[PDB]
């Protein structure tokens, strides 16, 4: 079956820069029957290009496609802010029609250090056997950040999950939550809960902490 391999996985580009997205096929795509779609979060895909190089109606001239055989490219000549999206290639030269796995285009901006906040478990949550501790990183760039949990100064492993927002449409920043989950039993056993944050915008790591049961 025709497997389409897109690269890179993620492109980070300032507005006005050239985006070059690649689609490679595992066999020749007949008649250059290759299409590109744009998909924004929460929205359906939008057709940009068909026949490898033909712009769909209404699509801005900055979008163009090229290629044939097994190698195809989508080019955004000068990136606009609203071009933040996942882009998928799709072949329709051979059935079953197949899609690539997508290239995400994100917007590069200047480095912004996160502000950091820590939340203890509520007494309401504690009344039923579970404790969640939450660390928040607000309004930062780039995406890459290290968020480490320490309980009485002991670095934790495997007991936290992270979630990250999409890039803000206004300021191109990210926000992140890290959530440490413990039983209420061992939560009460320890005193100092801390999240340590390492980021390109911070000269040294930043720690926020609370003492259990204190104020």
């Amino acid at each position: 079956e025709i497997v389409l391999t897109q690269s890179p996985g993620t492109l980070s580009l300032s507005p006005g820069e050239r985006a070059t997205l690649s689609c490679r096929a595992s066999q020749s795509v007949s008649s250059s029957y290759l299409a590109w779609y744009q998909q924004k979060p929460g929205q359906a895909p939008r057709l940009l290009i068909y026949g490898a190089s033909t712009r769909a109606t209404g699509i801005p001239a900055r979008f163009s496609g090229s290629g044939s055989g097994t190698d195809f490219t989508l080019t955004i000549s000068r990136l606009e802010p609203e071009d933040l999206a996942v882009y998928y290639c799709q072949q329709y030269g051979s059935s079953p029609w197949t899609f690539g796995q997508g290239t995400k285009v994100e917007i590069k901006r200047t480095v912004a250090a996160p502000s950091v906040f820590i939340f203890p478990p509520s007494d309401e949550q504690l009344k039923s056997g579970t404790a969640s501790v939450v660390c928040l990183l607000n309004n930062f760039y780039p995406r890459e950040a290290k968020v480490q949990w320490k309980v009485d100064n002991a670095l934790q492993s495997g007991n936290s999950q992270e979630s990250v927002t999409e890039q803000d449409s206004k300021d191109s920043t990210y926000s992140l939550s890290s959530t440490l989950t413990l039983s209420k039993a061992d939560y009460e056993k320890h005193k100092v809960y801390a999240c340590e944050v390492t980021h390109q915008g911070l000269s040294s790591p930043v720690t926020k902490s609370f003492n259990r049961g204190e104020c």
Binding site: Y37, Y92, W97, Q101, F119, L136, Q161, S163
Partner: protein, 225 residues
């Protein structure tokens, strides 16, 4: 204006059935090949089935052969997908999609680019039972503060959060849910605020979990000692 509106999605146990419909308007539906295309959460797109304008030629993805049936009612400008013997792997947002090619006929399933898409209808196949969230405050304490609401242990997706019945929107972050090892979902919604406002202003998160008809308003206020 062109509309494709899907419905019929929901939560179902493995082995059971669902029927999706897509209702079309604003274009000559009976002149186009129509398709269903699915997208698993966090994943890419996969063509599911297609059917020519006359409804006499159809094709299916390998993974749904013998289980799914595509059909159309040109009089009602509607497309359907009967989905039998559902599996966990069928979990996806299901889009109705119009082919770009106006039909050349000769009775064939062809085309292959989709220029109009619906909003999609969500299908979740799981043996897990619907469960509403517990809502816990993330209280602020000690020039900007933060507070929030923890929306924990619900199934299935999605849950929506607003603050102050829609009046608070700036500074709000409602995070993508994460799947916990228990098989249940959890998320947090936070908002940053000027610290001085903590004494002055009320903060209430409004949580809605439609699958379980769960609506919860949680007042979030500073903790004292």
């Amino acid at each position: 204006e062109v509309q494709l509106v899907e419905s019929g999605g929901g939560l179902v146990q493995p082995g059971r059935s669902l029927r999706l419909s897509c209702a079309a308007s604003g274009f000559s539906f009976d002149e186009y090949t129509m398709h269903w295309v699915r997208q698993a959460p966090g994943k890419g797109l996969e063509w599911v089935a297609g059917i020519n304008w006359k409804g006499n030629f159809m094709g299916y993805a390998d993974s749904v052969q013998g289980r799914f049936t595509i059909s159309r009612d040109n009089g009602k400008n509607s497309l359907y997908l009967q989905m039998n013997s559902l599996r966990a792997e069928d979990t996806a947002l299901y889009y109705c999609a119009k082919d770009r090619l106006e039909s050349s006929a000769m009775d064939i399933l062809e085309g292959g680019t989709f220029d109009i898409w619906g909003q999609g209808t969500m299908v979740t196949v799981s043996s897990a039972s619907t469960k509403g969230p517990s809502v816990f405050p993330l209280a602020p304490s000690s020039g900007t503060a933060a507070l929030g609401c923890l929306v924990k242990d619900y199934f299935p997706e999605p849950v929506t959060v607003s603050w102050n019945s829609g009046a608070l929107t700036s500074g709000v972050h409602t995070f993508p849910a994460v799947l916990q090892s228990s098989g249940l979902y959890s998320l947090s919604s936070v908002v940053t605020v000027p610290s001085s406002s903590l004494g002055t202003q009320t903060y209430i998160c409004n949580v809605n979990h439609k699958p379980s008809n769960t609506k919860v308003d949680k007042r979030v206020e500073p903790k004292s000692c």
